[PDB]
Symmetry: C4
Subunit: 220 residues, 4 copies
């Protein structure tokens, strides 16, 4: 009756993809999430999805903290929820990507967490922890490990300017990025530099992907 | 001990109309509501009621979010509560109306929900979902399906102006409405245009109803 | 393990006066209160106490909502807590008073409640409901029944001015009062008019009491 | 499954030092803390730690209320959490200190609490209660008993000026201090007066300690 995440939902007998209620350890009121019950056995809890550019992702700090969009479409679950999920157990991250040629690729990370040991995850900037890559899209996230989350109105990056504003996104920017999945939905090749839905290791710095989905599942 | 809504209250043995405590899935602290234990078998949870114009309904965003008025009289349960109720199960909507000639009519909708898949229902504007009409008052809500909630201080409608201000109410306005149950209590026929407690399909655009009650009950 | 109030605490075996944890129905996190386990069998939950003028009671709306002072001394439990307590069951009110001549008296009310049917008790002003008097101090509260709570910075009374400011207190003012237990601790007879810790029916309008305690216990 | 503090965690079978989830009585959502499972039998819940000056401790009221830093390094658990912990049972305080010569000392207090009887601990200033000293570092906290917590932006001390600003810290200042563990990490001897990580009874008023850790464990 109180699954902690999508894997619990799956193990309880729910095999279909869809929206379900989960109740993280330190977020007892619970909330709804979209569950991917197919990928590599299923049981993944989605926290990000781009697919048509219908939702504006160039949002400020509060929106990225609380979440926006809709579970059945493009959305960002919200950093407070991602933190509540990732700190209750050891999780891995799966990232699915797709270009405008119907081609697809993915990146899997053995460990993933946000503000794992932060007393106040929000004030500490929801620092990213991620490692152990494997997949077909190549790694475009490891260099971001250890970085705080930065938005257009809250700079915690390692650049003289605001990476989020500069690359029109919101991410665990360093100086500045190798991945920018919350960037502008520019739809394919574009002249501007690395300010679209980018995953450099796969499609470079000037190609805004058509689809992306970030999700997690207990490592053990 | 922890009914999720008025139907649970009824099924537990409480047959009288009145105020009871309910505890929605993602609103564990719970809150009180007025239960209609008579209508078509009973078990309806009320979230809106007009009956004498003693309460001001031309309120702003925060009031419509948190609720106002009193459970035993005119009131609006609050969008955050309606969301917590409607997303925990599939509900239908029953609307009771009465004119100043003691005549009455109703509208029943097979499905009803507010911000059903919104990650942050408040930021997403508590979008309305409603369908499958049947009744005696005629349908005045279907054209509103899919619309966000709009108040005098937060415009999310499809009009060049602010529908809530223009028609002195708060509703899931399009451009602008076919129903306006949270409008001014003008008491019957009135010269102003569609800015009273209107339900066009039944009493037209220039007649402010004497009584209205909106309530929900699990569909299945 | 989860008493709803001081009577539950008593019935569970705790016979000594002191501070205990209680968990109201719609306030699951719970909070601490001072329990009077002696008065007429014991089991009273205190929400107000004056005894030495060490605490400032001429506070604003937020302070009266959230509470101030200390449980072991002068304090105001806070309207949000009083509401959570009184709406979970039918309670009666007991008021103990003492003048500077060591004389004492009391007022008992068969029914007592704050914002009992208010959808949003705070926005509705935590309206007072009280009736059925009996005792030795005389009745100085019945005329206040039905009134909202008023502070120096939030006027909901029936006076052309702000009763709270005028009589230096915080109360369910009408126009203005017969009781003013949250008034200034003027210590006995005073020239100013009715702006001290007054209970008119007993000591008049120009005598600030030395001690007062307001508490509740389930009626049934 | 729901330990109230680090002692419960230990008694349940967890013998290693590390981060664990605890769920205080009036803070049911729970939060994570660092547990010291070695000191005098183990079972201590840490709420403060200095060790390298990597974290800024000259913070304002909200930061000291909500907490900052990281559980695995320098941090302040947050006064709201310390209050939730210390009011659920009788706790004692253990303070470990270390200078830059690798020397160490400690102070143990038989009783410790923050805002123990405050109706609104935050508005009341999280007053300190502490007594019964024993140890090797000498007592530098007893004179602070009874004092409210003061930050650079919220003065509740007994000085004509703001002790927190003057001594660059945050503490239960009187006029002003004998201990200042949240002071500037000045690293050893320093010319400025008592504005570093000081514990006067041991290293005087002009020596900023290298390491400090404050923790609690149920007295009984
Ligand atoms: C996308 C991104 O962050 N690019 C880096 C760096 O790799 C580029 O060479 C540089 C060009 O100005 O901008 C940046 O600092
Ligand atoms: C009540 C309401 O929303 N009326 C519509 C439309 O049906 C009317 O014809 C029009 C008249 O200006 O106003 C509106 O845009
Ligand atoms: C204490 C109090 O509220 N007194 C009333 C009324 O009884 C008095 O006669 C009047 C005198 O101005 O003030 C008031 O309006
Ligand atoms: C650290 C501290 O609080 N010192 C006290 C007092 O002991 C000193 O003598 C005095 C010197 O001005 O400052 C202070 O008021
Ligand atoms: C790509 O896939 C879609 C369905 O997902 C299909 O309709 C389309 O014809 C395919 N080809 C391209 C290049 O769009
Ligand atoms: C209407 O009904 C009320 C009672 O609900 C009754 O008192 C009244 O006489 C009836 N007729 C009219 C037109 O008011
Ligand atoms: C009143 O009672 C107190 C104890 O409560 C006592 O000390 C005192 O002598 C008594 N007389 C007066 C008038 O204070
Ligand atoms: C002090 O202890 C550390 C290890 O904790 C050690 O490396 C060092 O050599 C010791 N001596 C000094 C004075 O640093
Ligand atoms: Ca920057
Ligand atoms: Ca508009
Ligand atoms: Ca007034
Ligand atoms: Ca001062």
């Amino acid at each position: 009756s109180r699954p902690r995440d999508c894997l619990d939902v799956l193990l309880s007998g729910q095999q279909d993809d869809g929206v379900y209620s989960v109740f993280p350890t330190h977020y007892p009121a619970g909330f709804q999430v979209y569950c991917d019950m197919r990928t590599d056995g299923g049981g993944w809890t989605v926290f990000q999805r781009r697919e048509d550019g219908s939702v504006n992702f160039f949002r400020g700090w509060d929106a990225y903290r609380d979440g926006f969009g809709r579970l059945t479409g493009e959305h960002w679950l919200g950093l407070k929820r991602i933190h509540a999920l990732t700190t209750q157990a050891a999780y891995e991250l799966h990232v699915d990507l797709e270009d405008f040629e119907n081609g697809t690729a993915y990146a899997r990370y053995g460990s993933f967490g946000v503000g794992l040991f932060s007393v106040d995850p929000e004030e500490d900037g929801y620092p990213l922890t991620v490692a152990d890559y494997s997949g077909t899209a190549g790694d475009s996230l490891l260099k971001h490990s250890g970085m705080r989350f930065t938005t257009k109105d809250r700079d915690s990056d390692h650049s003289e300017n605001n990476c989020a504003a500069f690359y029109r996104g919101a991410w665990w920017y360093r100086n500045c990025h190798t991945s920018n999945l919350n960037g502008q939905y520019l739809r394919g090749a574009h002249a501007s530099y690395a300010d679209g839905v980018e995953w450099s290791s796969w499609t470079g710095w000037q190609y805004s992907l058509k689809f992306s989905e970030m999700k997690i599942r207990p490592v053990r």
